[PDB]
């Protein structure tokens, strides 16, 4: 039971926040990438566990740039946006609003990277602030280490949140 409906998700964020690493994580390295563009396939079971279950082959696109470098020719037919910020760089979170303007009804997900580089002391403060940040985009938030494959393991809280986001992208479209 495989769906042929297109689902295109853009991965946006400042240079170096972890976008390519995140695409590799979320797609289990089913990724084709080069200096210009990176696309991954994230296989997603929509409404899993019901007679309505269908498998979707979601595209995750990472084309880089900066909010001067514009890649708008890659922003066509987008159904959802993952906004990526580096939890050790507060400036990368301030730029998510501008990134979102490069492309309302399009669902958004906010993902913070490099959680492993935040000490248990300063962690509570960063996470309170990222909850507020996600609220600004009417979005759920996931904070993780992109280099740890357990970060989005099947059945984890993070995976449930990502799955909820993909379900919404499919429904809105
Ligand atoms: N410790 C740690 N390192 C990370 C994490 N995510 C990314 N990195 C590291 O940060 C560096 C940048 O990550 P990368 O995935 O290349 O960013 P990018 O957003 O794709 O960078 P770009 O210039 O091509 S646009 C890499 O060395 C990568 O290994 C993370 O969650 N934890
Ligand atoms: Mg990249």
Domain residues for the domain of 148 are: 1-173
Find the helix or strand (DSSP H, E) in which 134 lies.
Answer: helix 120-136
Question: Resolution of the experimental model in angstroms, please?
Answer: 1.7
Q: Which residues surround ligand 2, an ion (CB under 5 A)?
A: 19-20, 62, 64
Contact present, 79 and 7 (Cβ < 8 Å): yes
CA–centroid distance, 41 to ligand 2, in Å, is 15
Whole-angstrom distance, CA of residue 169 vs CA of residue 138:
14
112 lines ligand 1 (CB under 6 A): no
17 lines ligand 1 (CB under 6 A): yes
Torsion of Cα atoms, 146 then 147 then 148 then 153, to 10°: 40
Which experimental approach was used here? Answer: X-ray
Q: 116 a known binding residue?
A: yes
How many domains is the chain partitioned into structurally? 1
What are the two backbone dihedrals, phi and then psi, of residue 118, each rounded to the nearest 5 degrees? -105, 125
Per-residue HEC secondary structure of 64-86 comes to CCCCCCCCHHHCCCCCEEEEEEE
- Nearest C-alpha neighbor of 39 from the set 66, 63, 75: 63
- Nearest C-alpha neighbor of 14 from the set 116, 110, 83: 83
Residues 127, 132, 136, 141, CA torsion sign: positive
- Nearest C-alpha neighbor of 78 from the set 96, 97, 102: 102
């Amino acid at each position: 039971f495989a769906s042929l409906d297109r689902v295109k998700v853009l991965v946006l964020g400042d240079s170096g926040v972890g976008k390519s690493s995140l695409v590799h994580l979320l797609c289990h390295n089913q990724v084709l990438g080069n200096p210009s563009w990176t696309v991954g396939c994230s296989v997603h079971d929509y409404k899993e566990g019901t007679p309505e279950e269908k498998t979707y082959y979601i595209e995750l696109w990472d084309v880089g740039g900066s909010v001067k470098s514009t890649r708008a020719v890659f922003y066509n037919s987008v159904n959802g946006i993952i906004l990526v910020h580096d939890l050790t760089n507060k400036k990368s979170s301030q730029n998510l609003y501008r990134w979102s303007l490069e492309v309302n009804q399009i669902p958004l997900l906010v993902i913070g990277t490099k959680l492993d580089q935040i000490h248990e002391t300063k962690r509570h403060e960063v996470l309170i602030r990222t909850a507020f940040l996600a609220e600004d985009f009417n979005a759920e938030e996931i904070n993780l280490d992109c280099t740890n494959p357990r970060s989005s393991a099947a059945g984890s809280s993070n995976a449930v949140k990502l799955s909820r986001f993909f379900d919404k992208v499919i429904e809105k479209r």
